[PDB]
Every structure is written in structure tokens, then in C-alpha cells.
Design a protein around this ligand. Structure first.
Ligand SMILES: Nc1c(S(=O)(=O)O)cc(Nc2ccc(S(N)(=O)=O)cc2)c2c1C(=O)c1ccccc1C2=O
Ligand SMILES: N[C@@H](CCC(=O)N[C@@H](CS)C(=O)NCC(=O)O)C(=O)O
Ligand SMILES: [Ca+2]
Lengths: 198, 198
């Protein structure tokens, strides 16, 4: 199909789709809009939200729903039905935490305090659960990389902007990051993508 | 298989799974715990959250990942891969909303004003988007029922506890609720189930 991805010029919630197109070596239009474009772009969305992905003229929405669609019947999915369920569960566990953050808070001082509290008081319990889940295994699910490893790398990249020592007690979680980042199609995307804070 | 669901004695995040089991005619242990048992059980879960579902002695977690695992290869999944993406997308849109609500929050007026914010300003936008998305079709996705229809019924039920006028301008959304509640195995489950607030 012809693919058009619509999002801000940010990594954010589109980045998981971008990694999956990179890894799978699929061409697509990476359409990055400006704030000034938002009211106009918005009036065309089913639920007022981006990313969307248009596929031969038809609109998909919800970044995780899209990422799952793109990975079906590929090596990124999970080998078995049970591993597929595990892939989904780890992705939702990550997404639930990213969704706690007050991304749209106007007052900067209140936004900053709350980010600092989540990262200091809540994040270490999640990092420890993830570490323990991972064990000495090479990848989070099964024997080869899945889009849950991608998403771990993506989410921890953004958290590390706000909490640099996030992973100081979890060197196995750093290794996993580095393995995701050394996959050649993915290294290539990381090197060439627009550099944005988020 | 041998299925055991563990959740609180509420509909909450487990209800989607109970509707799936009911509709597919699958027997399972509906294990409901007490606040007082939680601290003890919690410390044994991979990520310290419920619901969990144990399948022949194996532990799955995350309610929507489990819901997807159970519906795969059934007529509750959509009929094409694109249609399965629209089912996951509707569910995520509804889950994103329900998740915005500060369920555990223990200050009655930060909680009580947040509920009013989402219920007064956000809800009507969502109800309007869903209605436009449905149009005059029978079901949200495709030509028959999917678990996105189940999630809408479940979500709108709890929303109606906090905002009984929610669906006043949206009679078609009410007709969808009733198409679902009319399905015999679902009807059977609704009368049979523990009566809880949430
Ligand atoms: N940057 C953002 C921003 S924001 O532009 O700064 O506002 C927002 C944001 N969430 C968000 C989710 C739902 C809503 S809604 N419509 O109310 O339901 C609004 C914002 C995320 C990110 C991420 O960067 C990100 C990175 C990795 C995983 C998840 C997220 C991520 O969830
Ligand atoms: N998105 C997850 C949410 C998991 C979750 O945070 N569940 C709550 C109850 S609805 C829980 O187990 N938390 C209680 C606690 O951690 O003390 C799911 O649907 O399974
Ligand atoms: Ca989510």
C-alpha cells in the first residue's frame, strides 16, 4: 500500500511506527506538521488525535493499534499466541506509565514538580519489575527482538531526558537499549531522524 | 484450557474479559479478592497489577492484552487485519478516556473537580466523535459484533453512573448499548453477575 504517517515534528507516540517501518524496510511518507497546522489537521481526525496512518486512502488511528497492525505476520510480533500476548502486555505496562505524565500542563512549575515526583517515587518500582522480568535473557520476549524491545528503547529514551540516572541500578536494561540501537536498520533511522527534544 | 481470573470484586478492568468468556461460552474461575488480601497477593504479581489471568498454570497480565489473546481467531476479532486495527483503536480510545479519571486519588476535591472537568468538557466531545464514527451502522466495526462493541457497553455503563445524561443527544449509542445487552450469552451474564458500583 501507499502509507502516510501524520504527527508533530517529534518522536513522541509516532516513533514506535517509525521504528517498525525502518526495521521492515518499508517506504512511507513521514508527514510532520506544525502547531499552526493543528486546527485544520484536527478537523480531519476521527477522534481529534494523532498519530494517524493513512493506508491506500483509509485512516488508521491509535499509535499502539497501528504498531500492532504493521507487525502482524512479521518476526517483530512474537512467535506464539502466548508470546504475542506477552508482547502486548509489556507494551501496555510501558504505555500506562508514559500516560501518567502531565504532558499538557500549562503551568511549568507544577508540570516540572509532577514529572520529578513520578520519576523519583514511581519509576524505580517499574524499572525493577522490568529488570526482574528480563532476567539474564537477551530480549524481553522469546529469543529474538520484538516491537516491545523497540518500545522499551523509545520510552526509556524520553524518560532519560528528564531523569539521567534512571537506569544506574539496571545495567541489563541499558544493554537491551544498546542492542536495539545496534540493529542496523534501527541505528540508521536513529542517526538520520530530525533531532527533537521529545 | 483451565482459566482463572483474579480481580477485585468489581466490573472495572476485568469486565471485558468476563464478557468475552460469556459470549464464547467458556468456563472459568472468577476469583474476586478483598482489599485485605491485596498487599499479600500484589507482591507476587510480575508488575503488581490486576487483573491477571492464569491459563493452564501460566500467568498473563494487562486486561486488553488478555482480551485480545482470547478473541484472536474468533468472530469477536475483526474480519481483516485492517478491521482488527480499527477494533484495537476504538478500545484504546475508550481506554485512554477511562484512564484519564483519577480512580485511586485520595483528596475529595482534586478528585471531585477532575471528574467534573472530564465529565463536563471532554466526555461530550468523545460521545460526539463516537456517534459520528458509528453513523447509522449496526456495530462499530464491520458487519457484526466485536469486542470493541463490548468495551463501549462496559465503558458507557460506568460513565453513566457519574453522568446519567451522557447519551441524551446520542440515541444511536444507546441503541448500540442495547444491541450488546440483548445478545443472549451477554444478557445471561448481566443478570447473573455481582451487583457492584464499579
Ligand atoms: N511528547 C508527548 C506528549 S506531548 O506532546 O508533550 O503533549 C504527550 C504524550 N501523551 C499523551 C497521551 C494521551 C493524550 S490524550 N489525547 O489526552 O489522551 C495526550 C498526551 C506522550 C508524549 C511522548 O513523548 C511519549 C513518548 C513515548 C511513549 C509515550 C509518549 C506519550 O504518551
Ligand atoms: N492497564 C492495566 C491497569 C492495571 C492496573 O493499574 N490495575 C489496578 C486496578 S483497576 C491495580 O491492580 N492497581 C492496584 C494497585 O497497584 O495497588 C490493565 O488494564 O490491566
Ligand atoms: Ca494505552
Amino acid at each position: 500500500p501507499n502509507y502516510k504517517l501524520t504527527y508533530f515534528n517529534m518522536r513522541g507516540r509516532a516513533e514506535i511506527i517509525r521504528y517498525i517501518f525502518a526495521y521492515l524496510d518499508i517506504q512511507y511518507e513521514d508527514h510532520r506538521i506544525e502547531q499552526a497546522d493543528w486546527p485544520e489537521i484536527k478537523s480531519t481526525l476521527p477522534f481529534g488525535k494523532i498519530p494517524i496512518l493513512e493506508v491506500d486512502g483509509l485512516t488508521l488511528h491509535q499509535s499502539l493499534a497501528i504498531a500492532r497492525y504493521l507487525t502482524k505476520n512479521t518476526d517483530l510480533a512474537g512467535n506464539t499466541e502466548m508470546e504475542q500476548c506477552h508482547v502486548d502486555a509489556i507494551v501496555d505496562t510501558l504505555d500506562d506509565f508514559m500516560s501518567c505524565f502531565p504532558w499538557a500542563e500549562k503551568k511549568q512549575d507544577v508540570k516540572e514538580q509532577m514529572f520529578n515526583e513520578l520519576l523519583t517515587y514511581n519509576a524505580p518500582h517499574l524499572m525493577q519489575d522490568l529488570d526482574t522480568y528480563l532476567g539474564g535473557r537477551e530480549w524481553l520476549i522469546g529469543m529474538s527482538v520484538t516491537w516491545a524491545d523497540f518500545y522499551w528503547e523509545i520510552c526509556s529514551t524520553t524518560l532519560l531526558v528528564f531523569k539521567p540516572d534512571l537506569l544506574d541500578n539496571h545495567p541489563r536494561l541499558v544493554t537491551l537499549r544498546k542492542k536495539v540501537q545496534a540493529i542496523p536498520a534501527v541505528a540508521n533511522w536513529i542517526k538520520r531522524r530530525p533531532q527533537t527534544k521529545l
